Amino acid sequence: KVDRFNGVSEAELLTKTLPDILTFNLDIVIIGINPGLMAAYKGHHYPGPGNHFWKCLFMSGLSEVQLNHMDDHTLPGKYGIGFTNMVERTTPGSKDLSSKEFREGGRILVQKLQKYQPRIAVFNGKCIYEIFSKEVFGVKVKNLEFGLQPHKIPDTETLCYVMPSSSARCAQFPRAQDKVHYYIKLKDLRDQLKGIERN
DNA sequence: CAGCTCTGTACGTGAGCGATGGACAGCT
DNA sequence: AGCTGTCCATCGCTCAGTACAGAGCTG
């Protein structure tokens, strides 16, 4: 046996959830798939020592310094960034989640986005946008692409932006460096929106 | 046949944890 | 010089979505 959670069982973590960090007037809401074990353990967003989220946020220039999971509550006020997940239930990986859980998450998610109305809904993972698109827009494309989506959240001006998951489980974008392009394009989209709005 | 959905599988990089053993200091 | 134990550098093992082939299904 290997002690990964400082004496806390995996079974206890599987019962924990991760709070949303949402406010009104946000530029960005990072939508994770669900909490992984370390996120359920810490009660903070993307604490995975290998998770690329905080590294990509810094390397892209979305944060001026390298931040970590303990900084997640400062993001709404300082950077205009919030957090939620498509699915509430904690699991080791995306593969443990059922189609029903994802669709229930999708309905709750669109209601949250319609309430907070961030400038950009950022899907941190292709898999959750695949479900969201079919469920909310009734659209299923053969080749779903990353980046800006051609659909706004219904009854809002909220854009949908898709990125490969920040999880290092994903072999197709093996390093933080391979995902940073999407974070840079996110920053550019944010800056472009703030330019049009300011007169 | 030809699209589709569904499921099983393979995949690159970097980090914590636990085991290993060489360096070395304190003893006598 | 001989013994013994700690430190810690280092290594192996495990871990943290996505694309796609092929089966099964249906138009």
Strand C nucleotides, any atom under 7 Å from protein beta carbons: they are 14-19
* Strand B neighbors by CB, 7 A: A 1-4, 6, 49-50, 95, 140, 142, 168-172, 174-175
Catalytic residues of A: 34, 45
Question: How many Å does it take to go from CA A5 to C1' C3?
Answer: 39
Task: Please tell me the experimental approach by which this structure was elucidated.
Answer: X-ray
Residue A133 contacts by C-beta under 8 Å, 6 or more apart in sequence? A139, A140, A141, A144, A149, A151
Q: Is A141 exposed, middle or buried (0-12, 13-18, 19+ CB in 10 A)?
A: exposed
Question: How many Å does it take to go from CA A1 to C1' C3?
Answer: 34
Tell me the CB-side half-sphere exposure of residue A60, using CA atoms within 13 A.
24
Tell me the CB-side half-sphere exposure of residue A131, using CA atoms within 13 A.
21
| Helices and strands (H, E) in chain A, number of each type | 7, 5
One DSSP character per residue, A46-105 reads S--TT-SHHHHHHHTTSSSS---GGGGGGHHHHHSEEEEES--S--SSGGG--HHHHHHH
Instruction: Determine the residue type at A20.
Output: D
Contact present, A185 and A147 (Cβ < 8 Å): yes
CATH code, domain with A123? 3.40.470.10
- Buried b vs exposed e over A23-59: b needs ≥16 C-beta within 10 Å? eeebbbbbbbbbbbbbbbbbebbbbbeebbbbbbbbb
One DSSP character per residue, A152-174 reads PPTTS--EEEEE--S-TT-TTS-
Question: How many Å does it take to go from CA A59 to C1' B22?
Answer: 39
Place of tokens 């479900």: A131
Domain extent, residue A49, equals 1-199
Output Rg (C-alpha) for chain A, integer angstroms: 16
Q: Is A85 exposed, middle or buried (0-12, 13-18, 19+ CB in 10 A)?
A: buried
User: H or E stretch including A121?
Assistant: strand A120-124
Count of domains for chain A: 1
Contact present, A57 and A183 (Cβ < 8 Å): yes
Neighbours of A158 (CB within 10 A): 21
Contact present, A133 and A106 (Cβ < 8 Å): no
